[PDB]
Write a protein that binds this ligand. Structure first.
Ligand SMILES: Cc1cc2nc3c(=O)[nH]c(=O)nc-3n(C[C@H](O)[C@H](O)[C@H](O)COP(=O)(O)OP(=O)(O)OC[C@H]3O[C@@H](n4cnc5c(N)ncnc54)[C@H](O)[C@@H]3O)c2cc1C
Ligand SMILES: Cc1cc2nc3c(=O)[nH]c(=O)nc-3n(C[C@H](O)[C@H](O)[C@H](O)COP(=O)(O)OP(=O)(O)OC[C@H]3O[C@@H](n4cnc5c(N)ncnc54)[C@H](O)[C@@H]3O)c2cc1C
Lengths: 458, 458
């Protein structure tokens, strides 16, 4: 229940659409990618411009409404919808302006990654981002953003040159390396904690065809494959990216039918560079076990981005446990394989990513992103359909994480689950957390923006 | 030179971005995909809403400025930029709202196809459109729209249920099967003649992974290959799509070095349905010649959409000559193969497409789109870099068209080049042209919207 004159001012300033609990499209509009999050906002505000976002931020502040901000809706913690507050929904703000000559993209805060990649790839350009096309640019970038171009070109934030952001007081600011640089440091890794980013500006790279391979190894050869991977990646050129996704084999025709539904290692790899050299490089890492269901192709970068994940199934419910590693020992490898063998849903993956490369050459305190120096990421990404099965899949992720606890440190804020609100200090570390609290105290002293991996002020 | 009060009235209502000739980004903003078209507008109005388009249309009408309308800028005739007028530039109106439950997408008139496919594929949904992701949804749909899903699900227009359209008098209309149906018939194939479409609504289809192959055949085997293709497609199920792209072989590692840069047939095919049936279906048509550089993949639809074309290179300059055929005779085939052997540029293709299927089952009078009953499309699509070579690549497409033209009928308005303004009556046929002229008399009597394949009123 809201103050009528304040609501009137808000509606008058707001050119976008307002979705109320009684409108037919409220239920669909309040659903986010993590279907285990069922929440009922008081109001959904579909913003169409920066002044729309200003109006919405101001209205939430005057009304005392809990603020959720939504880009693409992919929050693994469920942060983009609230019970009883306002959803500042940016999904209609999807435009990208690309300069081919200047190698620049200016993208609104509601963009979906596939819209961005399409727009830059019209000119054979790109900048690093995540591997699934319908992820939102917004939350991803603000937490760091990594994927197929990161070992070559860094995190998304390593290519961000400025933002336009609406702060909790209703003001609009530009943050860059030369203008409000403390805020610029903080948004590069600090999440939505300091305001609503309504435009991101990135430097772009020329990225022609990329030689790519995806294949599946039997878990019988699991030890030799994973050891080959971790050995190789410690000295591999930045141009090679090679990731392992332990999962049940999808029922696709390139795979023998007797392997369908059984745990396997799906290995995906690419070479950012000359495709003839890439072919040589990928053949050099494809044979540590027998590759089943091998697909090799020379792909436009936009098609590489659109390819993940084999099977093309969107799961309804998810639960993720994740952390970094500094090393992947033989015993950690057996633990990984032991829990991979117990995967139950065909949409679960136990992901082993190797970052390093350009990501680790950025000095640690240049941004708010922690753990550049830990090259391994393990993500126990449980995903399933049946709501009566939540406990069994959640358990797989939780137990696997616990079993590897001796090897795991830190944690990517963008892979954190709904129950992980207190992993924040550990993820960032004490020095970064303290600096972030100081920027929080300057720019969001009332913690208006607290549906995120939250950094309280002071 | 503009009346101040008229300009002030525009600025009072307009909330978008203006680009003037002295502005930094003028030169990139006025460039369109057909780089041979070098024109200099008085003003680029980058609209961000339906009221922006209303103000821009009324401003152009009141000011006497010639109106260009831009969606993705892919006009093969160069229609989306004008000398001395206003470009009503829709590229920032890129938002797509998808309802998974309703299997509906509402897309703004400025969307790029890859933005649209990213948004629908977030819900494993799709609807037919062209094969290159950076194509604009607006000009494509308005001329009809065909691609990988068309044999199965029709043209884009066969999945179109309504539009929001700003007409030349500045009013906003809805056209659907229930509201202004006369206009609705016309916008489904009649281009931007009737007003600026600010929103399209589409029915969507559930489209999971699709089995896909691309391979290259030597021109030595051209005759048996093309004859096998035309014979197979005559009775093929709707679920198989199979296209031939004659071109120079790209210098990719999957192809033998001795074929790089030589004329070949690039055959691409896919099955829209079960991927195991798809594998059986494609294996059966892959071997009409010896398949070199063979890539087979089981792809998310969004990645099939991002795949075209092998080499992933964007030409600066293009020149197109196209038509339909009712049958592809042996004599036509020989001519095709003879002119393909003369291809000079690595970006040129001679395209041989087979539509039919669900496109041909829509009654001919049901939309403004002509030649549903001709299943063959040939497109001599010259593309290149160096402006000093225009004559040699233009001559190639002209002479191939002339040597085939007796077998050709009609022409897709979206493949017309800048010198084909005179092909309009013939492309549409007498009946459709006459009905379109009456809709023109009703909705754009002053031909404000004449930078398109134009239908003058009455
Ligand atoms: C299928 C899938 C694949 C993924 N793949 C990758 C990957 O390859 N690499 C990677 O690094 N991450 C990846 N992620 C994680 C992703 O980075 C996070 O889920 C991220 O938060 C997604 O942002 P979003 O805008 O879609 O989500 P949302 O749910 O909308 O928002 C996430 C958070 O950011 C805030 N927020 C969002 N937009 C804005 C904005 N414009 N301004 C201010 N705050 C904002 C929200 O308030 C919230 O705290 C993936 C996630 C999914 C579900
Ligand atoms: C590389 C490439 C690949 C292609 N592939 C295919 C394909 O596979 N299938 C296919 O069917 N076509 C294909 N096309 C052709 C495409 O359909 C036409 O070029 C179409 O006109 C492109 O639309 P656009 O919005 O990008 O172009 P623009 O240059 O922006 O516009 C084209 C015309 O439409 C008008 N217009 C654009 N948007 C609107 C709007 N919202 N309301 C009113 N008028 C509007 C413009 O005024 C102009 O007359 C391809 C084109 C290219 C260059």
């Amino acid at each position: 229940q809201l103050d009528p004159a304040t609501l009137a001012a808000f509606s008058a300033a707001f050119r976008g659409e307002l979705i109320w609990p009684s409108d037919a499209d409220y239920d669909e509009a309040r659903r986010i990618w993590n279907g285990t999050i069922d929440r009922r906002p008081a109001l959904i505000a579909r913003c169409t411009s920066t002044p729309d976002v200003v109006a919405a931020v101001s209205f939430a502040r005057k009304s005392g409404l809990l603020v959720a901000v939504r880009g693409g809706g992919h929050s693994m913690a469920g942060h983009s919808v609230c019970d009883g507050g306002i959803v500042i929904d940016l999904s209609l703000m999807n435009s990208i302006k690309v300069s081919r000559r200047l190698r620049r993209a200016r993208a609104q805060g509601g963009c979906l990654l596939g819209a961005f990649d399409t727009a830059t790839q019209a000119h054979m350009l790109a900048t690093p981002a995540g591997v699934v096309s319908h992820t939102g640019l917004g939350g991803m970038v603000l937490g760091g953003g990594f994927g197929w171009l990161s070992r070559k070109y860094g995190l998304s934030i390593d290519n961000l040159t400025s933002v336009e952001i609406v702060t909790a007081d209703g003001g609009v600011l530009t943050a860059s390396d030369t203008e409000n640089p403390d805020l610029f440091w903080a948004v590069r890794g600090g999440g939505g904690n300091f305001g609503v980013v309504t435009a991101f500006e990135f430097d772009l790279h020329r990225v022609g065809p990329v030689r790519f391979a995806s294949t599946y190894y039997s878990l019988d050869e699991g030890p030799q494959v994973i050891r080959a991977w971790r050995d190789h990646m410690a000295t591999a050129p930045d141009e090679l990216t090679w990731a392992l996704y332990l999962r049940l084999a999808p029922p696709l025709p390139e795979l023998p039918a007797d392997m369908h539904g059984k745990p396997v290692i799906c290995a995906m790899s690419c070479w950012i560079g000359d495709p003839h050299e890439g072919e040589r490089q990928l053949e050099s890492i494809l044979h540590a076990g027998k590759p089943h269901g091998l697909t090799k192709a020379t792909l436009p970068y936009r098609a590489l981005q659109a390819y993940s994940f084999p099977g093309a199934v969107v799961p309804d419910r998810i639960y993720t446990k994740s952390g970094y590693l500094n090393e992947l020992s033989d015993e950690a490898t057996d633990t990984v394989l032991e829990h991979a063998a117990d995967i139950a849903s065909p949409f679960t993956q136990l992901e082993l990513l190797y970052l390093g490369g350009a990501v680790a050459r950025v000095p640690d305190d240049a941004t708010a992103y922690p753990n550049r120096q830990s090259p391994f990421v393990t993500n126990l990404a449980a995903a399933w359909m049946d709501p009566t099965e939540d406990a069994r899949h959640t358990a797989w992720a939780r137990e696997g994480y616990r079993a590897l606890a001796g090897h795991l440190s830190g944690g990517y804020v963008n892979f954190m689950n709904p129950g992980e609100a207190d992993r924040t200090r550990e993820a960032y570390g004490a020095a970064k957390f303290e600096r972030l609290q100081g920027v929080k105290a300057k720019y969001d002293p009332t913690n208006l923006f607290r549906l995120n991996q939250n950094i309280p002020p002071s």
